[PDB]
Amino acid sequence: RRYRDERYPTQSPMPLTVACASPELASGKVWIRYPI
Amino acid sequence: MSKIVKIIGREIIDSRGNPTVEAEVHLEGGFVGMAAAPSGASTGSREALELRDGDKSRFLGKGVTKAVAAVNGPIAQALIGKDAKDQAGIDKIMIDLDGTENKSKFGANAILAVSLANAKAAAAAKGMPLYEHIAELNGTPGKYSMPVPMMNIINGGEHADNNVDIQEFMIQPVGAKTVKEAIRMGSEVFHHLAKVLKAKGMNTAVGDEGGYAPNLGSNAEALAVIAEAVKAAGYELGKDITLAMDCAASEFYKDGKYVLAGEGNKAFTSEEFTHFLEELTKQYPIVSIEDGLDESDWDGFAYQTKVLGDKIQLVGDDLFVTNTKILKEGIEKGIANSILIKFNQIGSLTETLAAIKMAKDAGYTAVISHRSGETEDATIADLAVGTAAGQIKTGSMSRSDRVAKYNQLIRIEEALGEKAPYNGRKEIKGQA
Amino acid sequence: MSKIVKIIGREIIDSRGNPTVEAEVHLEGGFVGMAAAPSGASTGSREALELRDGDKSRFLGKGVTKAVAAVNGPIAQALIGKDAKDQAGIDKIMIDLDGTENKSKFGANAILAVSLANAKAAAAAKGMPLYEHIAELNGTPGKYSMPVPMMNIINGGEHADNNVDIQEFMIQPVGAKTVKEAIRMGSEVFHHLAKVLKAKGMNTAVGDEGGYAPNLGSNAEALAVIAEAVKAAGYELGKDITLAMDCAASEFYKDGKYVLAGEGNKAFTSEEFTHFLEELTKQYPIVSIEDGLDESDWDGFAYQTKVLGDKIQLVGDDLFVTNTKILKEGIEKGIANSILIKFNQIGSLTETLAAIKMAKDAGYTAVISHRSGETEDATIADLAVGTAAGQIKTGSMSRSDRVAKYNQLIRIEEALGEKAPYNGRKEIKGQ
Ligand SMILES: [Mg+2]
Ligand SMILES: [Mg+2]
Ligand code: NA
Ligand code: NA
C-alpha cells in the first residue's frame, strides 16, 4: 500500500511570482521548514 | 491548492552550449517547480524524439523554439486546472495529446520538462521534498537509499576528441559507508589521476562529462592509469574502489564489426569483443559494463550475457532506451541484467518509474543516469533516492553539470540519515 | 521584521572537485535562501582568507569543515533573531565577530556564504527576486540593466595545463540587442571555434572555465583563432563582437620582470609589457585588459593607464581585490579605470556593494565576476542586474558552472523586459 495522512499546506509561505525569484526553491535544492 | 494555474517553457543553455527546454509549473497555492531536459550525444536510435528547430541562423540549427512553443501553448492549455499530484494523469494528458509513439509532435524534451517540473510543484504542494514525493508516487513511501555512484573520470568516444573509443571509464567507491564519503573518495582519486596523467605528459583538460580526455596508447591503458591513481590516493582497488565502463559500442559498430579507431582500426566480431572485455575483467576489478555491444546486436548480447552475466553487471543503455516495451523483450530473452535509466530517452516521469519497477521485478538492477549534455538541474539525485534504485551515473567529480547532482545527494543524505542507507558493493548485479 | 530562525552550513563540492561552503538562512514564516562560496585559483595576495582545513587525509588538505563549523556555531548563534532585511547589520555582526582584517577566524568563505544566503532569504520575505531586493539595498530601486558579458573561450594560465600564459581570452557580443541574443552569439562563436581548432589539430577539451585549452605557438595566436571563429560564425569583429583579456600577470611576474613561460621564457620589463599589450590592441579590437601587470606594480599600472587608459578599459582584479580601501588609493593615483567585482575577495555583500558604488562614483566601470572555481549558484547574475553594473564575466559557453549564470540572466531578462536594457558597447569604459 501507500499511506494517507493529515496532509498539506493550503498556501505556499514563499510564493514566487516567477521561478527566477528563487531558482533554489523552484528547482528543489532547498526546502521550506514546516511547521509554520 | 494543487491545480495548475500556469506553465512557462523557455529556451535555456545546456552544459555543451546547446539550447534545451526548461519548464516552470505554477499551482494555485503559489507552489512552483522548475526542471530542464538533458540532451545526449551518443543517442540510441530508438530514443524518444528530441525535437530541434533546424534553423541554421540560430545555434547552428539546434534551437528548441518549437518544443518551447509546445510547452507554452497546447501542452500548458491541456493542463490548466488539472491536479499536479496526479502525475500519471498529467503525463497521460501530454502523451495522448502528442499522439505519437515516439513523442515526435511536441518533442520528448517538451513533455519531459513539464513532467518533471510538475512533480516538483506537486511535492511542494504536499510540503515535502521531491524524493519523498517520488517514493509516494512509486507506491513505496518512506523507502530510500543513497545510490552507489559510478564516476566517469576518463572520457572518450563521442564525449571527447581524443583517440579513446570506449566512451566512459568509471570508478565506484563501494567501500564508503555514506554517499558523502563516496564523493570525497571519488574527488581524491580524480585529483590523484591528474597528477598521474601529468607525470606522463598526458592531457588533463576535461571532456563533456568532466573526466580527463588524454590520448592513450590503447583503450585498456585508461584502466591502468586509473588503477594507478587509486593506489596513489591510498585506496585498495577491488576492495574500496571497483571499476565500470560504458563502451557505447554502437558508436564503433561498422559493417557488422566492432572497430577501435584509436587502436589502428582493430576489428572484432561480436564474440571476439565479448572475450576482449572478459579478459579485461580478469585483469581489473571491472564489475559493470554498459552497452558492450551494438543496440541491434541482440544475438551478441545473448552470448555476452552467458559469458559474463554471472560475474558482471551488464547494463543496457541504448539497448533498452528506458522503454518498458524493449526491456520486457530483453528480460524474456535473457539479455543483460541491468538497465540505464535516462528519463529523456522515454520522455516522462511515469514511464521512467515503470522502467525502474519492471527492472526490479525481474531482478535486474536500475542505474539512474544523466546525459552527456546536462544542466544545473539535479532531478536524478531525487529520483535515485526516491526509488531506492541503488546506483547512479552522473559524471566525473568536476563541472557543476555533474557535481550539482553530487551536492544534491549530500543534502538529501544529510536530511535522511539512516533512513537512506548507502548499501555499497551489494547494489551491483552479481556482487554481495 | 524578518527574523532569522536557523542557519545551516555544509561542505559541498565545487566545479573543480574541491570542497566549498554552502549556507542556508531560514526565517520565521518559512522564507529560505541558499548560497555557496566560489573559489579562485589565481588568488591575489590581498584577498580575504579562504579558510581550508589542511587535513591531508581529506580532499588532499582542501576540506572546509572549519569554515562550515563557523557557520553552524558562532555565526548562527550571533544571527538568530536578527532581521534578515538589514543586510548591512547582518554583515557587520559577522565581520565584527570575526574581528580580523582578512576574515581569517571564520573564513571569508563562511561569512560570504551566509551573507548571500541571508540576502536571498530577505528577498523571499519581501516577495521579490534577489535582483529587485539588491536594487533596494543599493538605494536605487527599480534601476536595472542586463550586463554585457565577456566570455572566456580560450583558457590558459592557472586555469589549464596548456602552454598559454595569458589566463583568459574573451569575446563580448556588444552588437546584440538583448542578453538572450548575446548568449546565442557567444554559443555560435564558441562552437565555430571548436571546428577551427580541430581543423588545426588542436585540443578541444576545456579548461576550468569552459573555454578550450589548446597548446599554441604563441599567446597572441589565441586572438587569431578567435578572430577566425567570429568570421566563420558570420559576425563582424569589432562591430558585432569585441575582445577582452585577463592576463593575470601576477602569475608570471618573476624578479621584477614579466616572463611568458609558454614562449620560451620571453621576458619583459613593465614598460615593455605595456607596449606589447598596446600592439595587440592595434592588431585586434581588444577593448578591455584585466590585470595586465602585477598586483604590486603600481608604478607600472600608472604608466599603463596613461598609455592605454583613454582607449582601453583597464580592469583591476588582483590589483584591487574588490576592496574599497585599495580601490580608493587607485582612484586617487590614476590607476586603472575599472574593477573586477568578486564578492569572495572581500567576503560580504555589503562590502561588495560599497566597491561597486565607489567605482561608479569615480567614473570607473564595475564588472561582476565569477571565480574559476564555481558552483551551480547564480548569485552574480542577480547582482549584476540589481546594481545595473553593465558587465559580467562568468565564463565560456560550456560547463553549467558558467552556463547556469547565463540561464539566470535569460530568466531575469524575460521577467524584466525593457525595464532591464541591454546597453551594448557603451557600457565598456572608453567606448
Ligand atoms: Mg551510455
Ligand atoms: Mg582575474
Ligand atoms: Na574520443
Ligand atoms: Na596554462
Author numbering:
A (entry chain C): 813 to 848
B (entry chain B): 1 to 432
C (entry chain A): 1 to 431
Sentences from the paper on this structure:
The C-terminal half of the enzyme, which is considerably more variable in molecular evolution compared to the N-terminal half, provides the scaffold of the degradosome assembly. This scaffolding region is predicted to be predominantly natively disordered, with small linear recognition motifs that interact with the canonical protein components, RNA and the cytoplasmic membrane that consequently compartmentalizes the assembly to the periphery of the cytoplasm. A segment of the E. coli RNase E C-terminal domain, encompassing the binding sites for enolase and RhlB (corresponding to residues 603–850; hereafter RNase E 603–850), also bears two arginine-rich RNA binding domains, which are referred to as the RNA-binding domain (RBD) and AR2 (arginine-rich region 2).
To explore the structural impact of enolase binding on the adjacent AR2 element, the enzyme was co-crystallized in complex with the RNase E segment encompassing the EBS and AR2 regions. Two enolase dimers occupy the asymmetric unit. In agreement with earlier results, the segment with residues 822–849 interacts with the intra-protomer cleft of the enolase dimer. Although some broken density could be seen for the N-terminal side of the EBS, no features could be resolved unambiguously for the AR2 segment in either of the enolase dimers of the asymmetric unit. Nonetheless, some portions of the AR2 peptide could be fitted to the density at low occupancy, but it is clear that this segment assumes multiple conformations. This suggests that the AR2 region possesses significant flexibility and does not adapt a single conformation when enolase is bound to the neighboring EBS.
